[model samples]
Target chain A: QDSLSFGFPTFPSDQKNLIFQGDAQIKNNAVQLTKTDSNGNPVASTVGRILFSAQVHLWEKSSSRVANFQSQFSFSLKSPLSNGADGIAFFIAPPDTTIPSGSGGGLLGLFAPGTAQNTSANQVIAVEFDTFYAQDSNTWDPNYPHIGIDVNSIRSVKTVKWDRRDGQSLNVLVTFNPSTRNLDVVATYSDGTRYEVSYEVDVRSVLPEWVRVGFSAASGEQYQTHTLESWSFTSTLLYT
Target chain B: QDSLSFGFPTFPSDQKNLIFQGDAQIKNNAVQLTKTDSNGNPVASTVGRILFSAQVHLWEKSSSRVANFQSQFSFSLKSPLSNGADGIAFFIAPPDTTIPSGSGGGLLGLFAPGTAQNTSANQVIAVEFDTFYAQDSNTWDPNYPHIGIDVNSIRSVKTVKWDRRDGQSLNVLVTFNPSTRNLDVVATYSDGTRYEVSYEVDVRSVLPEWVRVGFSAASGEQYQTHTLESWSFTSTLLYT
Candidate 1:
C-alpha cells in the first residue's frame, strides 16, 4: 500500500509509545476517556474537567516522502449534562512530551486561560466541542456552547452547535488537502448528516516536521461523562 | 467528538522535512514516486529499482490509552522487467534520522548487503514484496521471490506468493492491536482477494516510542521503472 491507514471500532493498539493521561480508559469495546461521579458529586473546580488526553508522535523530518494527511472518528458523551460542562477537542501538537494544565470552563485542554489564539507558540491545531458556554467574561469563548474549528485558540475562529440527536453517538471528520491548502471538517449527527466547515491551513508552515496526534476531553466541574463509543482514522505516511 | 477525527480527504501536502531518496516525485494528482529515464531504461544499474521510502509519526508516549489501529493503501509499480526487480515494502521504523543506504541489487533500501538479519538494531518492521530471489549459494533469502512479513529483517518470519493480477492497482491492509500484541496484514490483489499474514509483535519491545512510516523500493540491475498511482491511509492519532 502507498499511504498509512488505520481503522478501529475503539481504542488504539498499533506500534507503540502511545500515551494517555487522567481518566482515559477503554471498557466494553469503546474508549471512555472521561466520566462523572454517579452521586452527582462535583469534580475539582480546578480539575478543569479531568483532562483525559492521549498522544502518538510520528516520522521526523528524516523522510523525503512527507506528504499531507486526513483523519476522522466517532464518540459520545451523555450521562446528563445540563450545560455539557467544559467540552472536548481533537488536537495536533508539535513534538509535545506533556499536556499543559489548562483552566476549567473553556480552556478545552489546549490552552490555559489568557493564552493567545492562533499563535505558533501554542503549537497546535484543534477542533473543539464546547458544551458549557461561559458568559462570565472571565473565559474566552462564545456565550453559547458550540463546536469550533480552532487554530491554537480555544476562542475558536468558527463556531457551530453540536448537532444534537436523540442518541449520543456522534461522528466527525477533518481533511486538509495541501495542494489546495484547505482545512475542512464534517461533524456528522447520529442520523448521518455530517455538517461541513473549512478554513485554509498550511500545516507545514505552522508546525514542526513531527507532531503528536490525539484527543483531549475535559469537564468543568460536576460536568458530564465524556465517553467514546468507537473511532477510525487514517494519516498519510512519509519515507526516505 | 471526544476522539480526534479528521474527515478527509484531509490536508497532506507532505512538506519541508518529508524526505525522498532515489527517485520519488509527486505529480499529476497523485504521487509518482518512481519513474525511469531515457526510454525508461531500467533505472540505473546501481539504483537497484530505486527506493521511494516515506514515513509519518504520530503521538509519542503522551497518552495513557495507547490504542489499536488499522491501515490500508493502494499503489502500483511497473515499467519493464518481468521480474519486478527486488520489489517494495511498507514499513514502520523506530526513531531514525536517515535511510540506511542498502545496495542496489537486493537490500531494498533498508539494508546494506553485509548487514545482519532480524535484529532490533535495524529498528524496523516491514511488509515486503520481494520479486528478485537470490539463487546462487551466497544470499540469505528463500531463493524464490515472495511476499513476506519482516521484523527488522528482510528475511521475514512469514512468507507467501504474490497473487498476481498480471497488472497494477494493489491494496494492502494492516492492523496492529497491541492489547492483543498482534500485527495482522492482508495484501489484497486488485481483483479482490486479500492475502492474510500476521505476526505477534511487541512493537514497544523492539522499537522506540516513535517511528517513521513509508514505502521502500529497490531494483536489481537491468531492473524496471517503479511507478506509483495513488494511495490513502488512516493511522490513529494520540494526544497528551
Candidate 2:
C-alpha cells in the first residue's frame, strides 16, 4: 500500500511515511505548511514542503509503461494578512531532490532564488495554487488567484484563474493520464465553485523512474497559514 | 453491474439502461432535461426527468443492512435569457414515481402545485441546485442561487447559498454514509468555487428497499438549458 497507494483523512499522531522540511509541521491533526507562532499567528517569510517518504514508481522499465497517478486532498488557507503572498503546490521530483536555499515566497520552496539555469538534475513537475501575483518579476502570474502547472520553473506552462472566496476551504483532484500524458487538476472550493486545468507532459521523459511526490508552499511579507486537512493518492502502471 | 454501478463519460447512441420523462431527451452526447427549440434554444415552462431504468439496491432486506451510495456528475446550465428559472436536482424516489402536473417552475418538477400533504406514498430524497429563488411562496428560498436537500417536499430541510459564476459549469459529488446516515453534497463550480452541504436522513426508514435514482429539472417563464455532461453512480451493501 505504501508503494503505490495511501490515504489519510487527517494526519495521525504517529506521523510515519511522511518527510517534513522547513516550517512544515503536524498541527491540529493536519499538515501546516507555514510557520506559525505559539499563539497560532502565521509567520512571514517562511517556506515549507512535505514529501511522501516512499518513492513512487514513475515508470516501469521492465514493461515500458508509464504510471498514471491520481491524488485528492482537502485544504484550507487562512490569510490573516489582507493580501497573502506566495502560495502552495503539489509536486513530483527526483528522489534526491531537496529544498533550494532562499526559495521562500515567490520561489515556492521549489526553485533557488536567481538560479541561472534549471538543469536536468534539478527538474520538478508541480501544480501550484497561486495566491499572489508577481507583477514585476519574471513569473508573469495572472493578476487573480490562479492554479498553474509548472515544470522545472516557477513560471507556469499553463494557468487558470481560481476565484477563491474568502474563508473558503477547497478540495482538489489531480489526475495524470499516461496514455494522453495529460495532467488534469480539478479544484472544488467549499462553496461549490469548480475550476479545471490541464497540461500535457510526458512524465517518462521529464522525471526519473522513481520520484517523490508531495506538497510545497511558501509565505513572504504577506503571510497565510496553509493547512492540508486530508490527502489520498494512488498510482497505476498498466500491464504491470 | 447494471444493478448497482454504472458510469457514462457521455451519453451513448444506444441510450440503454435509462428512462426519460417529460421534456428530457438525449442530444449532442448529453442529457438535456429541458425542451429546446429548433435552433437549439431552450424552451420555457418545461419539466423533465431522467432515471436509471433499473432500481438501486437501497437496502438489503436479506441482511437488514442499508447501502451506501456515491454519485458524481458534471453538468452545465446555459441561460440564454437574462435569468434562468427553476433548477436541476439529483434525486432518489419510489419505483412508481411519476411527473407531477403543474410542477414546471418553483416546484422543481418533483411536487404538484398546492399539494397539501406529502404522504408516505409520495416520498423522495433530492439534492437541488436552485438557480431561481421563489419569493412570496411557502418555499422561502434564499434570494441567491443555492443548493438544498429536500425530503418529500420542495421545501428544503437544509440549504446553502451557491454562488455560481455566469456561464460556468459545475461538478458534484454526492455521497450517503450508511453508518452515519449523512447525505453530503459537494458542488464544485467551473471557477473552482466549492460548496458543501449535508443532511442526516435514515434512508431505510424513508426510501423503499429498491429505489430509482436520477435527475430532474424545470423551467418557468424564465428558461435555461440544463445539460448533464457525464455521470457515474455506485452503491454498496456491506457483507452482501
Candidate 3:
C-alpha cells in the first residue's frame, strides 16, 4: 500500500461564506476545473461553478472557444474589450437550465450576433459587462463598449456610460435578496474608488429558486486574457 | 540564465564497448520506438532496425503491441506467401546481398518455394531459431520448432532438437560477419545454459554492410500473439 501525506486546510460546509484568509501568491495551489472525455478528448461544460467568500485567486492560463460558466464574489476587472470575440459577462441564470453557447464565442455568444456570433436555444438572463459592440446599438465607444443588462436572451435592456480603459482591475460586489427578486452589484478600484450597478428582476421570470448564480469572463480575439484576483458572494431567501 | 551539470567516464572506442561498466535502470525511460506515417498515422514499416547494447528489463507494463506484427525480434523466412499477401519477415539482415525467402509457415515467413529453401537469397541470412516448421522434412513437435542454419536461401543445416521452448526467455548473441557473409547466433539462459547456432554465407551475397538487424515476432489466426522478453545482443566484425 502507498502511504501519502497531503498538506492543506479542510473546511466544513457549516461555515456560511467565511472569508478565506491566506497569502496572495500566484503559484500556490488553487482548485482547478478540467474537462476530459472517455477517448481522451476534453469536452466543454456549462455547469462549472465555484463560490468565493474571502480572498481567492483566479488565474486563466490559456483561452479557447470552449464553453465555461463561472461566478465570483468580489473582484476587479483588469482590461477593456481589446481581445477577440466578445468580452466577459456577469450572470444570474435560471436554476432549471444550465445550457451554454456553442464553440466560437462561449456561452455569452448567444447574446451578441454577427460573423463572430454564437447563439443557441436556451433561457439565459445575463448582465453583460460587455466590451465589444455588435449591430445592437445599446451603447458604444471608439475604444470599447458599455455595461448593459440582458433579459430573456442577449437583448439589451439598458446601457450605461463608463470609462473605457485597459489593464485596470475593477473591483465589484454582488448581493441577492429573494423576496423582492432584487440583486445589487457594486464595482470598486484599488485606488479607493467605487461604484454601484444594481438590477431588480423577478427570480421566477428568469430561473427557479436555488438557481445556479455565477459569473463568466472571457477574452475575445482582440486583447490578452485577464486574471481574477479575489471574489466573495452572499444571498438571502425571502418568503411571502 | 540556467546552468546544467553532467558526469561520466570517458574511454576510447575499442575500450568503450567492453569497458562500459555501469548499470542503468531503464523502466519507463528506456528507448521508445514508434511507427508512423507523414500524417502521423501509425503504420508498420516493411524494414526497420534498432541497435543498442543494454540489459533490457521487460516487465508486464513495459512493452505492448497494437496489431499486425508480433512484438518480438523476428526475421522473415521468404518473400511472398499465403494469407492473400506476402507475409512479413523479422530479422537482423546480414551486411550482404543475399535475399532470403518469400514463404511463411512459422519459419518467420522467410522460406519461399523456388528459393532453394533458404540458401539462394542475396539480401538475407539469419540464425533463425524458428518456432514453426515449414516444408522441412525434420518434423518438430507441433508445440515447438527447431533451429536451422540458412544459407544461400535454404535451410541447408539444422539442429537436432529445438533450442528453446515457446513462452520462455531467450538471451541471445547474434553476430553478423559482413566480410565472410556468416551469421553466428548463440542462445543462453540465466541458469548458465548456452547453445551456439551458426550459418555461413557471403555477406555480399545477401545484404549490404548496413543491413537492418533486430527481431520481429508475429502471430497469425493459427496461433495467438506471443511476447519476447529479456532480449540483448552483441556483435564483432568478422575480419577485425
Candidate 4:
C-alpha cells in the first residue's frame, strides 16, 4: 500500500514539478483548495460552482497498470455562513484534468449540471465531503455535511457527518487491501473522535489501470475557504 | 540538448533498480567491469567479449524519433599480463540488453567470432577504447591504447591512439548536434591531455528511437581488469 504520496510542507511550491491548476492557490505554506477572495459576497442567483485543483501522480510499472495503493489527506472547509454551500473531495481522475463548469455547489467541483446527476461517464474514483443534502438516494448523499466515497459517481457509497467543525482538523486515511478487496477509510477528528468506513471494492474494477490522484473543492450559493492543512501518501505495486 | 542525466558518484547502486549483467560487480564505490580475481591465469580459453548493461529512455511527443543525445563514460582496463588482450568500447544497443558470448580479445566484448566480423544486423552504436593493436593494424607492444567508434560493427568508424597511459582516468564525451548531424566525441586524459574523433552521424538513423548505453571490455589469451571509475550522460527526446 506504500506507493506514492505528497504533502505540501512548502510555501507555494506546487507550481513546479507537481501539477496544479484552476482556483487552487498555494498560500501560507499550504494549498488553499479554493479562492478565498470571493468570501462575504452574496450568493449569485446564476453563478457557476467554484472549484479549485491540484493533483498527484500514480505511476505504474514500465508498460503496466498500478493495481494497489493507499493515500491520506487532511483539509478544512471554513464558511461565514451557518451552513457551507458546497464541499470538497479527494479524487483519482484520468491523466488530464476535467473540471465541470455547470455546478460547484452540491456536486462539489467535479461535474457539469446537465450531465445527469452523479455521473461524469469518465474513469473516476472520488471520496467527497459533502456539506449539502440531496433528496435523491441515487445521489448517494446520506445526509447534510457528510463524508462519502464515490466510484464513477458523485454519490457516496457510505457516509458520516462532520466529526468536528469551527476550524478543527479532519484526518483521513484510505487504503486498499487486495486480500479482502476492502477499500478502508479512517477519519480522525479534532475532538479526538475517530470513524471508520469500509467498502468492498475491486479497486482495479472502478479505477483504470493507471490514474492520477489529487483534491478538488468547490463552492456554490453558500461559500467557504477550503484548505489543506497537510497531506501524505505511499503505495506499493501489487506484484514484485 | 540536455534533459535529465545520471552521474553515479556511488557504488553498484544500479543493482535492482538500474540493470547490469555477468561479472559486473560493484566494488569500491565503482563498477568493476571484469573479474580482478583472475590475475595471472591462462584466463578461461573461452573468454569472450565482456558486455555490460543499462539503457535510456527516448521519449518523443508523437510517433516521431529521438534525434539528439550525449553520453560519456570513464573506465580503466588493467592486466596482469604485460600486454592486455583486446579492449573496451562504449555502446548503444537495443532498448533491452543483449550479452554476446563468443570470443573476447579482438572481439572487444561485442560479437561472437562466428557472428561475422563486427557487423550485427540489429541497430548498435559503439566507441571502443582498444588496448591491444590488431596485427592487421601492426605490432602490439606496451601502452599504445586506441579509441574507435562504430555503428553496428566492432570495426571502428574513426580510430586514434591514446595520449596518456597506466591506471590514469579516462573521460569520454559524445554528443550529437542535429544541425550538422555530427556525433562528436572528446576523450579527456588524467594528465589533462585530450583527443577527439567524430564522424557524421545522424544518430536517429543508426540508432533506434531509444537505445541502451554502456561500456564493453574483454581480454584474450592475455587478461586484465576492466574497471569504470565514473560516468555521466545527458539526452533529449527526438523532436521535442
Using all chains and alpha carbons, the TM-scores for the candidates as numbered come to 0.51, 0.49, 0.32, 0.49
lDDT of 4 by residue, A129-196 (tens): 77767564225466566777777666566676754374666888888766677778888886678877
Give the 10-residue window scoring lowest on summed lDDT in candidate 1 chain B: B1-10
Question: Root-mean-square deviation of each candidate, in angstroms?
Answer: 10.1, 20.0, 23.1, 14.5
Predicted model with the maximum DockQ: 1
Tens digits of per-residue lDDT, candidate 3, B52-117, equal: 221111111111211011122322222112221112222545322222243323434444445544
| Models sorted by TM-score, best on top | 1, 2, 4, 3
Off by over 4 Å in 4: A1-240, B1-3, B12-14, B38-55, B58-65, B116-120, B136-144, B238-240
Best by lDDT: 2
Q: What is the DockQ score, from 0 to 1, of model 2?
A: 0.01
Docking class of 3: incorrect
Candidate 4 chain B: worst-modelled 10 consecutive residues by lDDT: B45-54
Ranking of all predicted structures according to lDDT, beginning with the best and ending with the worst: 2, 4, 1, 3
Q: What is the C-alpha lDDT profile of model 4 across B36-118, one tens digit per residue? A: 56442324232322222223434333435454667666776555566765666677776565566664667666665565243
Error of 3 at A181 (Å): 3.5
Q: lDDT, candidate 3, residue B67? A: 9
